[PDB]
Design a binder for this molecule. Structure first.
Ligand SMILES: Cc1cc(-c2csc(Nc3ccc(C(=O)O)c(O)c3)n2)ccc1F
Ligand SMILES: N[C@@H](CCC(=O)N[C@@H](CS)C(=O)NCC(=O)O)C(=O)O
Ligand SMILES: N[C@@H](CCC(=O)N[C@@H](CS)C(=O)NCC(=O)O)C(=O)O
Ligand SMILES: [Mg+2]
Lengths: 198, 198
């Protein structure tokens, strides 16, 4: 099909979709917009939020709804319906946590203090839960990579910009990041993609 | 398949699972806990949150992850792969809004204020987005009912406890709510369920 992804020049909420396209070797236009193109584009959107994906002219929204859509009937989705559920559950747990950050906060001091609170308390807690859930197993769910592993590497990459020692006491989670990053299609993508802070 | 649902004595985030169990005529233990028994159960969980659903001795988590799992290969799922994406997208839109509420805020003044703000400033815009999106169609997605329709009815039901006039300018959305409420299995559950505020 013909696919067109629209988001800011940023990893953010679009990146999970970018990894999926890359891993599944699906071609798409990676359209990145600047703030100036936003009000213009926003008003055409049924819900006014990005990312959105247009597939043969039909517009789709919600990053995770779209990511799930793309992994349908592939091994990335989870091998059984039970695994697919654990994949969905791990993905929302991580997403619920990232949504806790005041990404849009205009007051720099408030933003800093809130980030520090979340990274000092909530983050190490969530990290112990993920570490224990993963155990000494290879991937978060089942015995092959799923887009939950993808989401983990993506969410952690962003949290590490702000608290670089976040995984210093979690070697098993660092190992998971490296396994994901080393998947050839993902390793390729990570090298080609635009460099942006978020 | 034995099913045991654990959550507080309220509709809250467990309700979507309850509507699905009813619609599909599946029997389950509807376990409702008191706040004082929570800490002991929370400590035993992989991710320390409810609802959770136990099936055959495995604890699933994330209300939507679970809802999506129970509706897989059922008529409550979208009818096409794309429709399944729209079902997911609408559920996440509704969920992103409900998640903004400080449900567990101890400071009553701060809580009331955040509630007033969201209900007064944000809720109306969501109702506009949803009303336009529904348009003149019979259900949110496609030609038949999906669990997105259930989630709409569930979210709108709790928003209406706080802002009864929310849908005065949205008759098509009240017609949709009434439509969901009229589904025999849903109607039965609505009449039968414990009557709680939230
Ligand atoms: C449909 C839907 C419902 C809710 C919801 C209503 S009450 C609650 N949780 C609460 C409320 C109060 C308390 C409490 O303080 O005891 C608590 O622990 C949890 N959550 C949230 C999102 C959503 F999409
Ligand atoms: N849960 C949604 C979040 C979408 C969202 O809030 N997108 C942001 C960009 S990260 C946005 O458009 N906000 C700016 C605006 O609404 O103008 C998703 O994952 O797609
Ligand atoms: N996105 C999650 C939210 C889960 C959640 O935060 N549940 C709340 C109650 S609604 C909870 O377990 N709160 C008690 C606590 O966090 O200790 C879901 O849909 O299940
Ligand atoms: Mg969500």
């Amino acid at each position: 099909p013909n696919y067109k992804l629209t988001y800011f020049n940023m990893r953010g909420r679009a990146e999970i979709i970018r990894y999926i396209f890359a891993y599944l070797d699906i071609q798409y236009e990676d359209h990145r917009i600047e703030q100036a193109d936003w009000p213009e584009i926003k008003s055409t959107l049924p819900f006014g939020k990005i990312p959105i994906l247009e597939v043969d002219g039909l517009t789709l929204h919600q990053s995770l709804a779209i990511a799930r859509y793309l992994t349908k009937n592939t091994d990335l989705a989870g091998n059984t319906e039970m695994e697919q559920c654990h994949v969905d559950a791990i993905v929302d747990t991580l997403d619920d946590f990232m949504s806790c950050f005041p990404w849009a906060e205009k007051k720099q001091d408030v933003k800093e203090q809130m980030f520090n609170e979340l990274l000092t308390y909530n983050a190490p807690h969530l990290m112990q839960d993920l570490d224990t859930y993963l155990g000494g197993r290879e991937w978060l769910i089942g015995n092959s990579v799923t887009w939950a592993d993808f989401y983990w590497e993506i969410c952690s990459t962003t949290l590490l910009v702000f608290k670089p020692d976040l995984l210093d006491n979690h070697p098993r989670l660092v190992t998971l990041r490296k396994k994901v990053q080393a998947i050839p299609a993902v390793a390729n993508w990570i090298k080609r993609r635009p460099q942006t802070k978020l």
